[PDB]
Amino acid sequence: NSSLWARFCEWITSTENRLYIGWFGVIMIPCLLTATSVFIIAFIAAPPVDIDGIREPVSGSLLYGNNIITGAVIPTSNAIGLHFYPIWEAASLDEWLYNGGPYQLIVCHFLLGVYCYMGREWELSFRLGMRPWIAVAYSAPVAAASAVFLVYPIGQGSFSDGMPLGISGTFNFMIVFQAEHNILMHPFHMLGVAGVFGGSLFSAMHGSLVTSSLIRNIVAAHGYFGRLIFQYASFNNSRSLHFFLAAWPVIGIWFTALGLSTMAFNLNGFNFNQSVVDSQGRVLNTWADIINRANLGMEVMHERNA
Amino acid sequence: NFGQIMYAIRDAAEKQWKERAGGNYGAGTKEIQARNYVQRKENERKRREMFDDALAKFKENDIQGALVEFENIIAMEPRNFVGDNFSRNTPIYKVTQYNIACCYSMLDQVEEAIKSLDAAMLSGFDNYDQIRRDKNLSKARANPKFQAVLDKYDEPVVNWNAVKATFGA
Amino acid sequence: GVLGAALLCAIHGATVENTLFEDAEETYSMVTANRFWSQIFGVAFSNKRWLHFFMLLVPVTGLWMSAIGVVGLALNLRAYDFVSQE
Amino acid sequence: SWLACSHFCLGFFFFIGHLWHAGRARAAAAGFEKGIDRFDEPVLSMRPLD
């Protein structure tokens, strides 16, 4: 069994490696390495990109006079849109950079890498004999990343709408998105906020109860919880409790990702404008109307061109 | 001895580990893991040298000793073994129980040889040509149940009989 | 802190629920989970008490730090501008 | 918009269903879907990872 294929297969599939590789690792590792290398190099040094495609470059590279909080990899230029833009279809390297190819490269490699990582999370679980569906719990952040980076640009028809790979770029993306669509006033984003807050609450409470009970007992913690709030005798066993802990945030993030993808096809949140009207036809402002005014400001300042 | 009976039929260091109750990794688990690994390594080492003894003796035509050796090597098969490539059985396990299935044929024990080769098939002895072609096992091949088990584990790919019958109609 | 708290909640629930023993003693296999997460992610918990205390430490620190930030805003001390970039 | 949104959501959910059911089926076929045998843990048969 000394054949090159045999020993190579044994090496890859072996658990002796410090970090398990697996077959999914074959595509997972190189893709993430390419993505992180290009990301680091572009962030450190890269020329301004024409995000809006009207010859108004936007500096986003760390070396070109901007900070960590402000540095970002500008998304692909609006002119290209959904067309596939590797290096070799570009006229030249300088033009490739001016248009913003490295964002497209990074996002493609990153999506492939995260999918392969989700796969290996099942493969190793199968090796060790543990139950298989830890990948399902991982499908939430993967779904959200796919919605942010791939599905929303597809819906809007251009790759310039993808989230910039930076902090201030992320804030700009969120503000512009709230301007175009009422993300705040959409039930799926409400479910996402509920999921995140409930995850924090449950993590804190469970940690407190378990760490308090660990003295040298679970019955005492169960009685503590039952007596604290009026609720009694729920999550009597660790199985149900630890399943609920995983079930809440995962469903919340699934729903928020689905909401983002739904908005990718222009299905906005609730629109409660002029909902309240007095007699003989006047408009009484409500909080939704002040939110609408804020959206007006954001949107009007967003339209850089006439 | 397991070997003799089958041919006839033809904690001191673990108390710290039993940290598992407290849900902690610790150090006792590391000691138990090392001990289990080295014991396993010696297990397949001695199984390999026993297989070498078995083949060397089968070359001498002492099928009795070969059979006892092969029913002893299967004896020490680890329980709940998952292989590196999801094998579920040590690679020797499939070949040895094929050879014993051959040896049972030399003993004029076709009835149990059928079960031995059935168990060989279950383990994933995916090599189908020799069992059909090998003259050495031809003595047991005469039994119809041999072909029955071969068919249920090697089905004809194309139903020539069915297609011919449909053509007739 | 908040997002990390949600992450920890999800991961702990999935890990505990996916390493049960067939059917006192802990229901789930700590060694198996430690091996799994140390080989995939790189670092995995080894002490149960430390893990269940970390799940408590994260959100509390996050919200306390946000509260300090809001106190800073209460007097209009806001990290609003970068002078150099402006 | 209705068609696209509804069918994207349904496709994503059915993909998650594929993940779940495929994992469960493979685990059941392997034979350790009910849980670890608590006597012969495959991890224990491996050396400590250092």
Binding site: L19, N67, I68 | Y25 | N47 | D50
Partner: peptide
């Protein structure tokens, strides 16, 4: 020169991550 400071901080952090991965202390 602030760029060099930022890069130093980033690579230092990555070094801490690398050491935490590969150079773990065997517990007890």
């Amino acid at each position: 020169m602030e760029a060099l400071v930022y890069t130093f901080l980033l690579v230092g952090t990555l070094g801490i991550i690398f050491f935490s991965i590969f150079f773990r202390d065997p517990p007890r």
